[PDB]
């Protein structure tokens, strides 16, 4: 099977989680392409992948701001081919702020409204990722695809 | 059975939806308590209710914000006794915005992480509330009590 990981990341945190997910998936025979969301467009993006993992950090002062590179994909996510596609959502944040990983909830709800199959409960990284939590999430995705 | 309807509303729209839902529930034999979230504190809020309906509009000048009175309830929602509780989420918004009722997305996701049972898909109200849409949702809730 093939996986796509698309991430929005300002300081590299969510990018590092994407890369760590991909290293496991690739090691377990699921060919995985990791791309900055800034470099993709929505139409047909999920077609041809058996699973798509969406990563996005949360920013904004006293608000949920999606990491800015992700917003155009969120706006047009209805064109990506997610109906009955396996999806998982992840992202970095920090529980000292108001809406801890709120972008992850916003993106996961839209995926669900668009008919995606959510492979696992979302991965919400508080601060610096722990390799155990990232690895177990990658194993859920593998088990479900 | 007893229903709690807790709402955050700045211009009265989600308040008016709360009242319309309550009319339905009360006409179908529930004892409904309606409260503005500005007047409550989180600890133990849900205790003794058969179903809890959480209503909140979407604000924020630039991005997603919960209606301001709801924010402290959301932040301390873990104290509200939602584990194994039947919950429904509703809210007003405007689909001209990027994040249409994004406060509903965020509250719904948190309620499920806290172990609540969602009794119905969440109700997202676009602009002026439609009485048929509200009534259909209230009847979905009543059938799960
Ligand atoms: C001004 C500002 C606002 C933030 N707001 C949030 C927030 O609302 N929720 C959250 O969980 N984390 C919040 N964060 C934490 C960032 O998501 C966190 O630093 C994350 O590691 C960034 O990931 P990235 O490098 O992939 O962009 C905020 C950080 C800053 C500096
Ligand atoms: C400044 C401002 C920001 C808003 N932002 C959003 C938004 O991000 N998403 C949305 O769906 N609706 C948004 N709305 C629409 C309000 O949610 C809508 O007017 C609603 O009826 C208010 O309900 P309330 O009277 O219960 O507070 C915004 C409205 C205003 C005035």
Numbering used by the authors:
A (entry chain B), B (entry chain A): 2 to 146
How does the study describe this entry?
We report here the structure of the short-chain Fld from D. gigas at a resolution of 1.3 Å; we study its structural-functional relationship and the prospective binding region for an electron-transferring partner. The results show that the structure of Fld from D. gigas is a dimer containing two FMN molecules with the monomers orientated head to head, which agrees with the solution state. The amino acids from Ser10 to Thr15 form a loop that provides several hydrogen bonds to stabilize the phosphate group of FMN. This comparison showed that two FMN-coordination loops (Thr59–Asp63 and Ser96–Thr99) are not at the same corresponding position in the two monomers, in which Asp63 and Tyr98 exhibit the largest vibration distances ~6.2 and 1.5 Å, respectively.
Flavodoxins (Flds), which are electron-carrier flavoproteins of small molecular mass that contain FMN as the prosthetic group, are found in various microorganisms, and play multiple roles in varied pathways. Flds generally contain one non-covalently bound FMN that acts as an electron-transfer center by switching three redox states, including the hydroquinone, semiquinone and oxidized states. In the present work, we isolated a native functional “short-chain” Fld containing 146 amino acids with the cofactor FMN directly from anaerobically grown D. gigas cells.
